[PDB]
Each structure stands twice: as structure tokens, then as C-alpha cells.
């Protein structure tokens, strides 16, 4: 229940390969496009199917 030996740098760096985050799924709005999220109402001018709700 206690590590037998210390961990080197190669093993640490190898294990961290999948610890990362991806880009968001985003697209611009037809009116005053501001590169909002897909299937969401934008907060400045990404007017979802009409007016810009917020």
C-alpha cells in the first residue's frame, strides 16, 4: 500500500499523455456572428432563430 520505489520522469511524462482537454464545438451566428456554441443562444449577438435572448 506504499510505493516501493520512486517514479522516474519518463514514466510520469508517458502517463500524462491523455490528460488534456479538447476544443469546444462552436459556430458563428447568421446575424452579427460572434462564434457561439452550437445549439445554444449566445449572450451578445448570436441571436438564436430571432432575437439575441441574452
Amino acid at each position: 500500500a506504499v510505493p516501493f520505489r520512486r517514479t522516474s520522469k519518463m514514466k510520469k511524462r508517458l502517463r500524462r499523455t491523455h490528460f488534456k482537454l479538447n476544443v469546444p464545438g462552436m459556430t458563428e451566428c447568421p446575424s452579427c456572428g460572434e462564434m457561439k456554441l452550437s445549439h445554444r443562444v449566445c449572450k451578445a449577438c448570436g441571436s438564436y432563430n430571432g432575437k439575441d435572448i441574452n
Binding site: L21, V23, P24, M26, E34, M35, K36, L37
Partner: protein, 109 residues
């Protein structure tokens, strides 16, 4: 080819590299949208320093912002605050509160 630094903003460097990896290499206009659509905690700070670099390029060198791309986007580490937390049976383990330096360089493509 202007730059901007943060210098001892209170955040752990390992958690800021996670976003600075995302932002590096892209084009300046696209960069801000990704930065303010990401839900992490370092995004407002990185966005502020990037805006400062763009403004430096605009005023001091008359370089225009329709071409800029991000060339250097590293994160360093700064001084540490050491605290304590009492455990069972009078033990008093140790706690670290880390800090980081943030640097961004913008260049004309």
C-alpha cells in the same frame, strides 16, 4: 513583435498549461473565441494578457491586428506560500499554495 507578462498571478502552473496548450499557434482573432468559450478558471487571465499584448502591438508599433498570430505561449512558476492543516492526533501536515508567471508573444505573419 510585442509581448505581455503576468508575473505572480495566484494559480497553480500545472492547471494553466492545460489551456495554454490549447491556445498556442492559432490566429489572434480565432484565439479569443476559444478562450472565452472554455469553462476553466485560467481562461479569463489568459484572455486579459492576450488582449494586453494585442493592444501593445497596436499602439507602440503600428502593426494592425488583422494579421497577428501567436508565436510563444509558455507558462513558468513563481514563489510558493507554505501553510499548515491539523490532522488526527496532533500531526499538522503541510499545504502548498502555488503561483505562476504567464507570458505571451504576438508577431506579424
Amino acid at each position: 513583435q510585442a509581448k505581455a507578462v503576468a508575473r505572480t498571478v495566484r494559480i497553480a502552473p500545472r492547471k494553466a498549461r492545460l489551456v495554454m496548450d490549447l491556445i498556442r499557434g492559432k490566429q489572434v482573432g480565432e484565439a479569443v473565441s476559444i478562450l472565452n468559450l472554455t469553462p476553466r478558471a485560467a481562461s479569463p487571465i489568459i484572455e486579459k494578457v492576450l488582449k494586453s499584448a494585442i493592444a501593445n502591438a497596436e499602439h507602440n508599433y503600428e502593426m494592425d491586428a488583422n494579421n497577428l498570430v501567436i508565436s510563444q505561449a509558455f507558462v513558468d512558476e513563481g514563489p510558493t506560500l507554505k501553510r499548515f492543516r491539523p490532522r488526527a492526533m496532533g500531526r499538522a501536515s503541510q499545504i502548498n499554495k502555488r503561483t505562476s508567471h504567464i507570458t505571451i508573444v504576438v508577431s506579424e505573419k
